[PDB]
Design a protein around this ligand. Structure first.
Ligand SMILES: [Zn+2]
Lengths: 52, 191, 189, 77
RNA sequence: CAUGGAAGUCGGAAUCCGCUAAGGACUGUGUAACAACUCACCUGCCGAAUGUACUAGCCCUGAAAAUGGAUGGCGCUCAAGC
């Protein structure tokens, strides 16, 4: 098992992210535009699917 | 639209000395000395008062003015580092396989080296060498901590990111396998 | 800004009718505390504080109604209130000083003075001993009551109180904070 | 307590809004027990508070509990 | 009203008033049920701008074919481009 606080710390780096709908890039949680250039800085973002 | 005058100021405490020549900054204080080169930016440095440094840009564009604030905070970081230092902390997160590390001493030069063994039960021994001026220690306050300290934020932070990026899980669901080493706290040596 | 208009006429009307004005410097005091002193002083005097009146009292200085208003302009800095009353100076000197609450710590609150737990018997249920072991305090359970054999320093003066100790301070009814009304200099007294 | 007849058991499962009561000094008489617990400048404020307190009952007939309290035309005591 | 228990926060149906500058019969967390906690709202510091929705100029994404290759060539960046 993993201590609850440590699991929260690790989740920050690989669980709480936004995903662009055009190039599947990882984005910060509060982002509004993709940073990559090949998708044209699109603003069609969705949250990263949770584990359940 | 070009802005005529944009100015910023940096205070300097009465403990250290600073000298600027040909856009080459040298900062020296109680805890050591650092140098940075800013020859790629057109800035005019000046001494506003007895303990205030001024810098400004004339007839700059919107893109050019943006770099003015970037320069100000970088030099302030240099002043803090030479009088207060930096300190990073890291933690180990594992489910089944314990993670063993060995911070061996100086290898006939100033660099420190960290050895990581038994990551998710693999037979690789993986080695990373820190930048000069950075010292790595095993914490005794409590279990599973790495403490990194030094004078310059750029060297301390980049070396810390090197350790985190080397422990990666491949061909697995990363929402389930949270194994790895992560950074958890940033601060100064003093206070 | 309907309530904004009601402040302008209220301030000018009340200042002229009462010849005596007393200033109070209240800061970081619980809202409920103002309720009881308002109820205690409900019969005589009304207390009312709001945002700083940068030009609202200065307008009262322009006309010659009170040449002494312009003398009181620089005294306002921030979070300072005014009291309108007709009573004597001596009776209102300590009237608003009542009901100083014993504010508990807020998980990191700076203790101005060193806090110590005198030797004694807590008397509570011995199921809470896990809280004591967090600080590593030597405790012996006697008659179902946790007893501190030797005094143990909680936190040094001027140092941040530990989150476990700050919670532990609540059930011990000891805290470094006591919140009360602050009295500022009024009319060059 | 001023409710329509008895609150018989097994009848409160459905809607129980049939609690209409008259609006008179009977409610005002019950206000004297509280005696304006929080200021209210004696029973004058308490009467307005107690009068509008039973907002569910909607006072009596056409009159509403809010209108009676809003209209400052009744005697203090 | 509901009820082994539901105190804003299982659920069903209404949304008033005191005191104020402000705190909702409440947007969440949370208790067997209270609590604790969050939000909303107001106050202290600062010093001049700020928010949302639309129009069209240059630039970018959309833009994948077979011998080696063509603004005529070299080359050109406050142009030697518009
Ligand atoms: Zn994208």
């Amino acid at each position: 098992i993993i201590e609850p606080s440590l699991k929260a710390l690790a989740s920050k780096f690989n669980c709480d992210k936004m995903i662009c709908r055009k190039c599947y890039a990882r984005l910060p949680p509060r982002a509004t535009n993709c940073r990559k250039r090949k998708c044209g800085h699109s603003n069609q973002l969705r949250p990263k699917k949770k584990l359940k | 639209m070009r802005y005529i005058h944009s100015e910023e100021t940096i205070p300097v405490p009465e403990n250290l000395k600073v000298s600027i020549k040909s856009r080459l900054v040298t900062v020296e204080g109680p805890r050591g000395k650092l140098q940075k080169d800013l020859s790629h930016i057109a800035v005019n440095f000046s001494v506003v008062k007895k303990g205030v440094i001024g810098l400004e840009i004339h007839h700059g564009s919107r893109k050019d003015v943006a770099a003015l604030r970037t320069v100000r905070t970088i030099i302030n970081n240099m002043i803090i580092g030479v009088t207060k230092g930096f300190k990073y902390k890291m933690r180990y997160v594992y489910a089944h396989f314990p993670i063993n590390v060995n911070v061996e001493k100086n290898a006939e030069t100033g660099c420190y080296e960290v050895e990581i063994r038994n990551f998710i039960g693999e037979k690789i021994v993986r080695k990373v060498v820190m930048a000069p001026g950075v010292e790595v220690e095993i914490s005794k306050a409590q279990k599973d901590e790495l403490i990194l300290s030094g004078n310059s934020l750029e060297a301390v932070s980049q070396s810390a990111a090197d350790i985190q990026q080397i422990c990666k899980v491949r061909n697995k669901d990363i929402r389930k396998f949270l194994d790895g080493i992560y950074v958890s706290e940033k601060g100064n040596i003093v206070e | 800004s309907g309530n904004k208009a009601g402040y302008f006429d209220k301030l000018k009307g009340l200042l002229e009718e009462y010849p005596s004005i007393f200033v109070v410097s209240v800061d970081n005091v619980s809202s409920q505390q103002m309720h009881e002193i308002r109820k205690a002083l409900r019969g005589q005097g009304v207390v009312l504080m709001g945002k700083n009146t940068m030009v609202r009292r200065a307008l009262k200085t322009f006309m010659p109604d009170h040449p002494e208003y312009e003398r009181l302009l620089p005294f306002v800095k921030g979070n300072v209130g005014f009291v309108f009353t007709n009573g004597d100076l001596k009776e209102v000197r300590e009237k608003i000083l009542s009901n100083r609450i014993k504010a508990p710590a807020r998980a990191g609150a700076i203790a101005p003075v060193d806090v110590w737990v005198p030797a004694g018997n807590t008397g509570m249920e011995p199921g809470k001993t896990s809280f004591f072991q967090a600080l590593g305090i030597p405790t012996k359970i006697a008659r179902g009551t946790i007893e501190i054999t030797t005094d143990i320093k909680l936190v040094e003066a001027g140092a941040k109180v530990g989150p476990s100790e700050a919670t532990l301070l609540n059930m011990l009814n000891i805290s470094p904070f006591t919140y009360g009304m602050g009295i500022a200099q009024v009319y060059d007294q | 307590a001023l409710k329509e007849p008895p609150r018989d058991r097994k009848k409160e499962k459905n809607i129980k809004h049939n609690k209409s009561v008259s609006l008179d000094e009977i409610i005002e008489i019950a206000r004297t027990m509280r005696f304006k617990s929080f200021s209210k400048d004696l029973k004058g404020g308490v009467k307005e508070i107690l009068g509008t307190a039973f907002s569910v009952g909607c006072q009596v007939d056409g009159k509403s509990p809010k209108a009676i309290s809003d209209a400052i035309e009744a005697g203090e005591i």
